[PDB]
Amino acid sequence: SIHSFSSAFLFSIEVQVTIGFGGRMVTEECPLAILILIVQNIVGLMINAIMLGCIF
Amino acid sequence: MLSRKGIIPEEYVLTRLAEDPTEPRYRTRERRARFVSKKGNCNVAHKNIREQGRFLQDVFTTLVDLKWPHTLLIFTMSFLCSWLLFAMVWWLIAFAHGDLAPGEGTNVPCVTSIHSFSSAFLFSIEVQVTIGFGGRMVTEECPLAILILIVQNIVGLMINAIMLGCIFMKTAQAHRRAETLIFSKHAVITLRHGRLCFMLRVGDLRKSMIISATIHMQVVRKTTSPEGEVVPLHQVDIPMENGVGGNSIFLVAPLIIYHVIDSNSPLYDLAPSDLHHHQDLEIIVILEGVVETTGITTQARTSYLADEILWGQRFVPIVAEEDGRYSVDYSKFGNTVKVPTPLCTARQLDEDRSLL
Amino acid sequence: RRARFVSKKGNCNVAHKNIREQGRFLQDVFTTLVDLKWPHTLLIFTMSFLCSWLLFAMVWWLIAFAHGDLAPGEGTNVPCVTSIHSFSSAFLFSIEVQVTIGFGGRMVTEECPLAILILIVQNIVGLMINAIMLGCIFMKTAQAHRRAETLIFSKHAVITLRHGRLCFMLRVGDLRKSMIISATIHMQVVRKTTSPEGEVVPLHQVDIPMENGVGGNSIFLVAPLIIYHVIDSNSPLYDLAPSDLHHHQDLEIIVILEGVVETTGITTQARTSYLADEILWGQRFVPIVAEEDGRYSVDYSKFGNTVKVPTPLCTARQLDEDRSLL
Amino acid sequence: LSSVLHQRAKIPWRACTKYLSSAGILLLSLLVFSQLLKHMVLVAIDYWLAKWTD
Amino acid sequence: MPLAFCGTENHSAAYRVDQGVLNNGCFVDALNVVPHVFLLFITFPILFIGWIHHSTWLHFPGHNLRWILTFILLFVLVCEIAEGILSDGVTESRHLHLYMPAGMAFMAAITSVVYYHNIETSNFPKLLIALLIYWTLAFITKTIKFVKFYDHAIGFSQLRFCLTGLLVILYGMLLLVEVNVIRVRRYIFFKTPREVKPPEDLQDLGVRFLQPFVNLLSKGTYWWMNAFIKTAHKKPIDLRAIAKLPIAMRALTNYQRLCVAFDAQARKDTQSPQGARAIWRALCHAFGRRLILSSTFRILADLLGFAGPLCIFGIVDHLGKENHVFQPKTQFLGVYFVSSQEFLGNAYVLAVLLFLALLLQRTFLQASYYVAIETGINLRGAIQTKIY
Amino acid sequence: TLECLSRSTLLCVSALTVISYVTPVFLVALLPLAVVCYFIQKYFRVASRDLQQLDDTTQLPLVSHFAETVEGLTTIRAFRYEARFQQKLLEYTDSNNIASLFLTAANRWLEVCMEYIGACVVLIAAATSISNSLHRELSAGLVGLGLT
Amino acid sequence: IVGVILLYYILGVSALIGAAVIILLAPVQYFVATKLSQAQRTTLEHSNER
Ligand SMILES: CCCCCCCCCCCCCCCCCC(=O)OC[C@H](COP(=O)(O)OC[C@H](N)C(=O)O)OC(=O)CCCCCCCCCCCCCCCCC
Ligand SMILES: CCCCCCCCCCCCCCCCCC(=O)OC[C@H](COP(=O)(O)OC[C@H](N)C(=O)O)OC(=O)CCCCCCCCCCCCCCCCC
Ligand SMILES: CCOc1cc(CC(=O)N[C@@H](CC(C)C)c2ccccc2N2CCCCC2)ccc1C(=O)O
Ligand SMILES: Nc1ncnc2c1ncn2[C@@H]1O[C@H](COP(=O)(O)OP(=O)(O)OP(=O)(O)O)[C@@H](O)[C@H]1O
Ligand SMILES: Nc1ncnc2c1ncn2[C@@H]1O[C@H](COP(=O)(O)OP(=O)(O)OP(=O)(O)O)[C@@H](O)[C@H]1O
Ligand SMILES: Nc1ncnc2c1ncn2[C@@H]1O[C@H](COP(=O)(O)OP(=O)(O)OP(=O)(O)O)[C@@H](O)[C@H]1O
Ligand SMILES: *[C@@H]1O[C@H](CO)[C@@H](O[C@@H]2O[C@H](CO)[C@@H](O)[C@H](O)[C@H]2NC(C)=O)[C@H](O)[C@H]1NC(C)=O
Ligand SMILES: [K+]
């Protein structure tokens, strides 16, 4: 369900915030997609830690 | 085979004595150990220590007090390994239930839409990070699937909790790992107000001053007591000659830590003859205090040797009164210049007062 | 046996009794959860999360039962929550909502407002439980960094001759690599003394000067040091005698090492006691620090080892007075 | 530092020149060519063996 | 076409569960992956966190039975990887289960010795539980696979059965090693842990020839010399840098050993003028315990060095056959099994064996050299003292 | 030493030339090893000469002490200083032996490191050679020459 | 012993026949080595006198 940059923008919103609507989801047979999903998840978690740490 | 020693002659030789080479590097090294370094890094060999047991809390504490790039690597590895380990067991359950088997609509898999290990990796990522896309989701009547989902969530919560705790304490404590306190490389013994005074200069390289700065000066000497006692590193505390006799010092512009060597002071017998490097006469100056911004007490020790003490020298004035503010020339901070001064011994100086 | 004021380790074995009714409020029980051990904290939190998931799982199942949705047979009535056909499905939905996984296979519907109200309750409870869990994690993490009791004192103290004058003496050592900033030595005599007006104080504590150069309580521990108080006319030990060495003799010496650890930045205390039988006359502490080419070496095996030395087996009142005559 | 760098000098030019000057012009080049010639044959006999065994 | 763990035979029908899941050869292989994956994930953050020295030099009991077991366990795992790659040559399917389970077992074994070595230096035996809960975890599943190969009547003809039957014994042997550490040190669920302290020889800061006090692999590799060699390149070597030799090699200790041998050699033999025969007997009795060790290493080194010429013969013989036709010729249970008579016939397998044999041979030869030198140098110290 | 050095170095370069000719890929694989080998060679030389020189120096006093103890045995025993001289020998013997022991350790460290480097060459030469003969049809004798 | 046996297995009875030359020439090397030491002793005696 990826059709434009708006859809891609919405997918990144769903993953980094960890919403995961499920209309746009990661499939298999695309290892590059899986690798960036891991990278984006790690980056999103470390940003949250910085935000939580800075708030403290 | 291809070596010169195919057969060893082992014949005796007659070479006369020739010991000293041109290079004096054989006897050049003559440094004597010190229990406190110039940079404040004390180093005393605590040899033969009773084996106190080690605990896993030490490893956990080491995780908290690690560096920043290392913490990222540890947690990235922790997150990636956690997802990977659970993805492996998710794949096992699907395999053991026949989910990974070719298509069959009769059975309901323990996890829906799980085909390969790639899907298993994605399913574990969705569950642990709580993205939950829903294309691959848990189903009922598979008690092992429910059990692992509980285990993965519990494990994920504890791992995330550790990461938040480690990050939270890192910002609090690691900020207070900087030592911006500078002493003088060489101290002096000068003549102020007629009385001999041992002086050194300390300054602050951080704009926020140290609150409630306490200065402790101690002479370390292997002072064998006349009764018979012998102690290798006896520490004698030295007064400060402050305006009130206390140990409080205000640190805005660097000042001179001047102590008047009197009869009470052990330096009453200090002489330039006993000022050589191989003499057991060392001074330790410690300026404890708490930085206002963070609130963590800070300590910065320094050690002055007899060879590092310059007799009869005066510190250069630093603070110039400009039109608006005061100028500090930190380039000439620890520079000491000579001055015509008596060069006798403070113990022998008592005769000058007696004569007059 | 003989009663002690403070244990040798520093446990301070004293008994409290006849105390008024303590508050015992609710806010203290949370502190109990804070100071739990690592295995117990994990057990407490796993139980709390599992109980929350299970409790809400039961109530979602009840709501589906009340709406008549899990009854077999497809109907036009939209269920309160979709794709719920068992309690196992109800448990999974509770897991998804509370942990915020939100798969979407089972989703809330606009059918009944009871589901909407209870979804709010589950999320708020889940959010507050995470907050409590994260709050407890922060408090417990500091305890790991604490590492309080790591200071060493000699098992027995001595009365020796330093600078000619008799003095009580003990040894202090810091096993920790990290330094202890703002160290402070406090020496106290715990005795039963009577007043000339009839007062009989049970456990009198008298301050004891440390005989430091600056006349203060501050020390600096990088190597094991001798802490000695000169027994003079201004001390309660001026009336000491060799006979005051029995186990049941009325005497006790308390040494306190206050000081904030440099790394942790929090104050730590190390109380130790020396009984009369642990006070050894006519002994001296062997020198420990040995100079080496690399760095100064400290032999911690001989930390408590002593060498016998002949010292005046008399009273300080008679010994000091005889100095003028001699 | 400076002494160590000065001490750790193989002095190849000086020692080689002493041996070369003492040996002369004929007996020095002859040894270099003879030793190299011997070893090029050793490579050749193994190489020829490979071709023959092939 | 996609990389499949079990393979792509008959429309990927090798993933069936019917007739018992444990009866599926792919699944028992998969169960073997799990303990290795567990240890990798469990201890990786631990090694990343920790990332005088005398207080951290105590050697755990069985310090030698662990390294030699690991090396032989590493060797059989290299053979397992090589055998698995041979097995999937016939079919077009990748058949990832033939070698990947074994391949990362070798990786996990490397981490286990690294993790154990860190525990050996940093005296924290309480952490030596992961390996315990791993070794039995690495043993149980392996036994299942072994029994299943016995259930299908694989027999010793197949190479996998021989390697698995050997590899389970290696896991069993070091499992005994792990519980042996527990028995001596008594740190797990025990009351009084026995006190073990580093040897008194290294307690003094005046020992720098730390050859006796080092791990077995560094004993055979001389890895401790790297610090001294690097230090040499900056600070010229003086007697301060070379601190005095340990008590095991001191001249006085050697003379005591030489003197005690003479008493034994002259007591029973009353008619001993301390001549050539008596002195030779004294030298043999005093230093035989090390000369034999040098000879044992040297004899093993000579034998291994011969495998190189045999490996060349096998490699070139297989290469001279212009047919270049390779096949395992059998498929026992849908997975092709190669035999030993063809495992040592492959050129790449033989080359790997040649490389491994060369590594072992050179270590043994050099180890024998040092043992002989140490005995020879020690005798010189003792002989000089006796002459003086 | 000059003859042995020339033969040893000529045999070495001959071996690398043959292996590179047998498998050109080895030339690429020669770049890492010839880098690290130099480091091993460079460091060992600095660690050898010093050690060798130190060994020779430490032999001078010990043997000289022996001569004194026989030229002045009567005076040595008369002074009742035999125990001190025995201790002097033990220090001298320990100093010489540890100088010799470290030299052997340095020799063995170089030998093992070069042995591993040579073992790696064998694997590289074998792997490339079998690959060449199976696909590009390299001569069987050439494979043998490379391995030997 | 392992070398000669392995040589016979590989090259047959030709390697053993050929390798006997190196085996038989080793005692000749021993005589050269023993006389080389004798020649070294003569030079050492003359050099020590010098
Ligand atoms: C619905 C499912 C949800 C699942 C989610 C998670 C469930 C959590 C369950 C709660 C219990 C889990 C315990 C985890 C402990 C985490 C870390 C922790 O607290 O360890 C710390 C402690 C003690 O260990 P230590 O510190 O190394 O002690 C050694 C040393 N003397 C020291 O004190 O530093 O604690 C320990 O580490 C425990 C010590 C026990 C020692 C036993 C050794 C072997 C342990 C493993 C085998 C158990 C025995 C066999 C059981 C067989 C059952 C069939
Ligand atoms: C189907 C599978 C079959 C596989 C078969 C082949 C596989 C073999 C792999 C395993 C190799 C086995 C090595 C055995 C090592 C035994 C050691 C041994 O017996 O000596 C033990 C001793 C060590 O104590 P010490 O220093 O003498 O004690 C101090 C003094 N003597 C005292 O009084 O207290 O003496 C010493 O140890 C002296 C030090 C020398 C060290 C020699 C061992 C180093 C080995 C290095 C191997 C390198 C890795 C190669 C393996 C490749 C595999 C992939
Ligand atoms: C200082 C000598 O210390 C050593 C001592 C040894 C043990 C040894 O058998 N040595 C003699 C052998 C005899 C038969 C000549 C030798 C000396 C020089 C060169 C090579 C060799 N052969 C050794 C055996 C294999 C073929 C070549 C090894 C190496 C060393 C070393 O660090 O160099
Ligand atoms: N302008 C400055 N800024 C920062 N640190 C200074 C400055 N001037 C002196 N220091 C510090 O004061 C100490 C010595 O003071 P001094 O003025 O004598 O410097 P110095 O002789 O140039 O020192 P060094 O040789 O250590 O660099 C050192 O720790 C030095 O880092
Ligand atoms: N055992 C105790 N437990 C708690 N608080 C106590 C206790 N004893 C004394 N206090 C506190 O100290 C104060 C003085 O004690 P005291 O014996 O005079 O009590 P009191 O006369 O009963 O006091 P009040 O009437 O104010 O409660 C008390 O008022 C109370 O605040
Ligand atoms: N080398 C040492 N390392 C660490 N702590 C030590 C050491 N020596 C003594 N202590 C500590 O000092 C106290 C006892 O001192 P002492 O020198 O008498 O030891 P000890 O006789 O070995 O004592 P114990 O039997 O109680 O362990 C104890 O608190 C002990 O932990
Ligand atoms: C596994 O694959 C083999 C391939 O030989 C199957 O055996 C036959 O395979 C062909 C197609 O390759 C089918 O048309 C035959 O029907 C198969 N024979 C039988 C008796 O089934 C074998 O069946 C496969 N295993 C399965 C499907 O379980
Ligand atoms: K979420």
* Residue B242 three-state SS: coil
* DSSP codes, B189-236: EEEETTEEEEE-EEEE-SSSPEEEEEEEEEEEE----TTS---TTEEE
Spell out where B226-353 has E strands: 234-238, 248-249, 255-256, 259-260, 282-291, 297-298, 301-304, 309-311, 313-315, 319-321, 326-328, 336-338
Q: Strand pairing of B255-256 and B201-204?
A: antiparallel
Point out the ligand nearest to the CA of residue F105. Answer: 3
Q: Are B147 and C50 in contact (CB under 8 A)?
A: no
Instruction: Write out chain C residues lying below 8 Å of B233, CB-based.
Output: 223, 289, 296
First to last CA, chain F: 26
Chain C CB within 8 Å of residue A53 CB: no
Residues of B in contact with C161 (CB under 8 A): 225, 227-229
Query: Residue A21 C-alpha to ligand 3 middle, in angstroms?
Result: 74
> What is the number of the ligand closest to the CA of E24?
7
Of the residues F56, F104, F112, F113, which should be mutated to test ligand 3's pocket, given the most ligand atoms within 8 Å of the CB? Answer: F104
A1: tokens are 């369900």
**Who's near E254: CB < 8 A, 6+ residues apart?**
E378, E379, E381, E382, E385
DSSP secondary-structure letter at B255?
E
For residue C287, give Cα distances in angstroms to B232, B281, B350, C305.
Answer: 6, 19, 35, 10
* Residue carrying the six token digits 């998804």: C96
Residue ranges of B for the binding site for ATP? 48, 50, 330
What is the C-alpha separation between C8 and C275, in angstroms, rounded? 9
Residues of E in contact with B98 (CB under 8 A): 15-18
Quick one: tokens of E357?
A: 């044999």
d(CA E191, CA B14): 67
- Residue C300 CA to residue B176 CA, distance in Å, equals 32
Atom 34 in ligand 1: residue holding the nearest Cα: B55
| E288 vs E283: CA distance, rounded Å | 8
Q: Is C100 annotated as a binding residue?
A: yes
Q: Enumerate the residues of chain E whose CB falls inside 8 A of the CB of residue G3.
A: 306
Are C297 and E240 in contact (CB < 8 Å)?
Answer: no
Could you list the residue range(s) of the whole structural domain that residue C48 is in? Answer: 26-145
Question: What whole-number distance in Å separates Cα of residue E145 and Cα of residue E152?
Answer: 11
A5 assigned ligand-binding residue: no
List of residues 6+ apart from C297 with CB closer than 8 A: B44, B45, B47, C289, C290, C291, E205
* C-beta neighbour count of D6 within 10 angstroms: 11
Nearest to B90 by CA among B42, B161, B23, B139: B139
- CA–CA distances in Å: residue C181 to residues B175, B304, C155: 18, 20, 25
Identify the chains in contact with F, defined as 3+ C-beta pairs within 8 A: B, D, E
Token pair 């002097």 is found at F88
CA neighbor of E167 nearest in space, from E33, E61, E70: E70
> Which residues have CB atoms below 5 A from the ion given as ligand 8?
A 18; B 130; C 100
Distance from chain centroid for Cα C270? 10
> Measured in angstroms, how far is the CA atom of residue B10 from the centroid of ligand 3?
15
A9 is in an annotated binding site: no
**Ligand 6 atom index nearest CA of C156:** 18
Query: In three state form, how does the secondary structure of chain E look?
Result: CCCCCCCCCCCCHHHCCCCCCCCCHHHHHHHHHHHHHHHHHHHHHHHHHHCCHHHHCCCCCCHHHHHHHHHHHHHHHHHHHHHHHHHCCCCCCCCHHHCHHHHHHHHHHHHHHHHHHHHHHCCCHHHCCHHHHHHHHHHHHHHHHHHHHHHCCCCCCEHHHHHHHHHHHHHHHHHHHHHHHHHHHCCCCCCCCCCCCCCHHHHCCCCCCCCCCCCHHHHHHCCCHHHHHHHHCCCCCCCCCCCCCCCCCCHHHHHHHHHHHHHHHHHCCCCCCCCHHHHHHHHHHHHHHHHHHHHHHHHHHHHHHHHHHHHHHHHHHHHHCCCCCCCCCCECCCCECCEHHHHCCCHHHHHHHHHHHHHHHHHHHHHHHHHHHHHHHHHHHHHHHHHC
SS3 sequence of C39-78 = HHHHHHHHHHHHHHHHHHHHHHHHHHHHCCCCCCCCCCCC
**Residue B191 φ/ψ, nearest 5 degrees:** -120, 100
CATH number for C98: 1.10.287.70
DSSP state for residue B340 in the 8-state scheme:
-
Whose structure tokens read 């005296």?
Answer: E123
Decide if E372 touches F, using CB distance below 8 A: no
Mutate to test the interface with E, among D2, D4, D6 (most CBs of E within 10 A): D4
Please state how this structure was obtained.
cryo-EM
Q: Whose CA is nearest to atom 27 of ligand 5?
A: C20
Provide the H-helix boundaries in chain B: 25-28, 56-64, 68-96, 117-128, 143-173, 346-355
CB E338 within 8 A of CB E13: no
Q: Is C135 on the interface with A (CB under 8 A)?
A: no
The two tokens of residue B79 are: 């997150």
- Our CA angle for A33, A35, A41, nearest 5°, is 100
Chains F+B touching (3+ CB pairs under 8 Å): yes
Give the closest ligand to the alpha carbon of residue B315.
4
Q: Are strands B187-192 and B309-311 parallel, antiparallel or unpaired?
A: parallel
User: What's the start-to-end Cα distance of chain B, in Å?
Assistant: 90
Ligand 1: which atom is nearest the Cα of residue E132? 44
DSSP assignments along B96-145, one per residue: HTTTTSSP-SSS--SBTT--SHHHHHHHHHHHHTT---SSS-B-SS-HHH
Element (H, E) at G36: helix G13-49
Ligand 7, pocket-test mutation among E6, E10, E333, most atoms within 8 A of CB: E10
Residues in chain E with CB shorter than 8 Å from the CB of F86 are 388
Query: Which tokens go with D39?
Result: 């070893």
| Structure-block tokens of residue B265 | 């002071």
Q: Could you please report the per-residue DSSP string of C118-182?
A: HHHHHHHHHHHHHHHHHHHHHHHHHHHHH----EEE-SSEEEEEETTEEEEEEEEEE--SS-EEE
| Minimal CA separation from G10 to chain E, in Å | 9
**Which residues 6+ apart lie within 8 Å of E340 measured at CB?**
E159, E162
Give the separation between CA B155 and CA C251, rounded to whole angstroms.
Answer: 56
